[PDB]
């Protein structure tokens, strides 16, 4: 009766400690991103393997657009402009010779004539993009009636596919310009100590329960090499040779 409480307590412990490991804390490693980089306003490369970030945020002040050539340029991109499907599955802030416009995966999120953003009114271009929202919010300028020129499409399937922060600009970092993405590193975790203890305890308890069940099955009068495991046969020789030959 002393070896029947073992096979009970060490069998329930190894169950309540093993049905509770996929609920205990882990330690995730979280990566971020932020161009500029070295304060030099050049392209970089970051080929996300999940093909999409968690967040995205661009600021793009107004002086950057005011100080561009009469040609368009791409003040801020996510894939190279000449990619295979770059207009699709990417985000652009193009500043073409007639208008500024923030685009997305083949949808025009916002568009404003250039002679309006080139005015003392506009201040920056916030291009946040997260779960359930892809708005474009040109600060400064006002929609004709009363709105501050915001955009929409709250579709959560509009996050751009990121392979870099390619830009058509050269020179030192102008103040205000700031991109920021959040990479989806959710699978790269490591267990805490409160989870290693639970794993070790579950395994030790399920070993002790089996040892006690073994010691309990021997209340019959038994406990503790035949002639089959001692012979060798032509069949065994053939099978061993035909396995070793086929392995090579």
């Amino acid at each position: 009766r002393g070896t029947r409480w073992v096979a009970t307590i060490a069998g329930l412990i190894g169950f309540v400690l093993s049905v509770a490991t996929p609920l205990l804390p882990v330690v995730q490693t979280t990566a971020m991103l932020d161009w500029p980089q070295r304060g030099q306003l050049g392209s970089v490369t970051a080929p996300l393997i999940s093909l999409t970030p968690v967040d995205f945020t661009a600021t793009v002040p107004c002086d950057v657009v005011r100080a561009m050539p009469p040609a368009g340029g791409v003040v801020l991109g996510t894939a190279p402009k000449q990619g295979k499907d770059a207009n699709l599955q990417a985000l652009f802030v193009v500043v073409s010779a007639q208008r500024v416009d923030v685009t997305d995966r083949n949808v025009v999120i916002l568009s404003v004539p250039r002679e309006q953003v080139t005015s003392p009114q506009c201040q920056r271009i916030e291009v946040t993009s997260t779960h359930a929202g892809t708005f474009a919010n040109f600060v400064g300028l006002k929609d004709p009636s009363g709105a501050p020129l915001r955009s929409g499409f709250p579709d959560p399937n509009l996050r751009p596919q990121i392979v870099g922060v390619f830009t058509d600009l050269t020179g030192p970092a102008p103040p205000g310009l700031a991109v920021s993405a959040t990479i989806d590193t959710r699978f790269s975790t490591r267990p805490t100590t409160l989870k290693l203890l639970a794993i070790i305890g579950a395994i030790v308890a399920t070993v002790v329960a089996l040892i006690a069940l073994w010691r309990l099955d021997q209340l019959d009068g038994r406990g503790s090499i035949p002639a089959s495991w001692r012979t060798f046969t032509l069949t065994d020789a053939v099978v061993i040779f035909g396995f070793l030959l086929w392995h090579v």
Partner: peptide, 30 residues
């Protein structure tokens, strides 16, 4: 390569999660 662009610095850190936390769904299609 299409554009001459060097790799990026990644701004790493750590955070202790739980067994039921999730930052949202994965964008698998339109």
């Amino acid at each position: 390569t299409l554009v001459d662009a060097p790799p990026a610095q990644l701004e790493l850190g750590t955070a202790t999660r739980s067994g039921l936390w999730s930052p949202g769904k994965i964008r698998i299609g339109p």
